[PDB]
Amino acid sequence: AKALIVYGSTTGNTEYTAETIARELADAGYEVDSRDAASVEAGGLFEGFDLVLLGCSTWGDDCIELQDDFIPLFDSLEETGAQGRKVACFGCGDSSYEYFCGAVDAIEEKLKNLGAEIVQDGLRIDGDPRAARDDIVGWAHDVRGAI
Numbered sequence: 001a002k003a004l005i006v007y008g009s010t011t012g013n014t015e016y017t018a019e020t021i022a023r024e025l026a027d028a029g030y031e032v033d034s035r036d037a038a039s040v041e042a043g044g045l046f047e048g049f050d051l052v053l054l055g056c057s058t059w060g061d062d063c064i065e066l067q068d069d070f071i072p073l074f075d076s077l078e079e080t081g082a083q084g085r086k087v088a089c090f091g092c093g094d095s096s097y098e099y100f101c102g103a104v105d106a107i108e109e110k111l112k113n114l115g116a117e118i119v120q121d122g123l124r125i126d127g128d129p130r131a132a133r134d135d136i137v138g139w140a141h142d143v144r145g146a147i
């Protein structure tokens with residue numbers, strides 16, 4: 001089984017979360033392809049993958065905005081091949097702001113409208129992800145056993 005993980009991370013929290021996810025999947029037998037949103041092209045990006053995990057941090061504060069590297073991919077999500085694709089989302093945020101991990105809802109909602117199958121509720125991490133390594137591994141385990 002092939003799984004693709006694309007993450008948008010500026011201070012490295014969502015990136016750390018992605019690597020933690022990759023390990024879990026990799027150990028469970030998956031062939032994981034983890035890429036930084038900054039280095040990918042939307043066009044047919046999900047082609048050939050059995051599972052796609054999208055991670056992205058939230059910004060803007062006074063409004064909901066996605067991590068800059070992920071925006072291009074988001075704006076072109078209709079060209080990724082999400083139709084019937086088994087996907088799940090995650091991201092890091094800070095409850096101190098008004099819209100906690102809003103980036104995760106935005107991606108989930110658009111993936112849903114594009115015909116993707118969200119196999120698990122998004123992983124929403126508050127603060128340092130390392131302090132939540134247990135929730136991350138479990139979430140990865142959960143999505144993995146629900147495809």
Ligand SMILES: Cc1cc2nc3c(=O)[nH]c(=O)nc-3n(C[C@H](O)[C@H](O)[C@H](O)COP(=O)(O)O)c2cc1C
Binds near residue numbers: 056063127
């Ligand atoms: C200007 C600014 C705005 C932010 N807005 C939000 C927000 O709306 N919602 C949220 O959950 N976190 C918000 N955060 C917190 C970040 O999402 C948090 O620092 C996160 O760990 C960043 O992840 P990064 O390393 O993965 O990409 C904001 C941080 C800054 C500096």
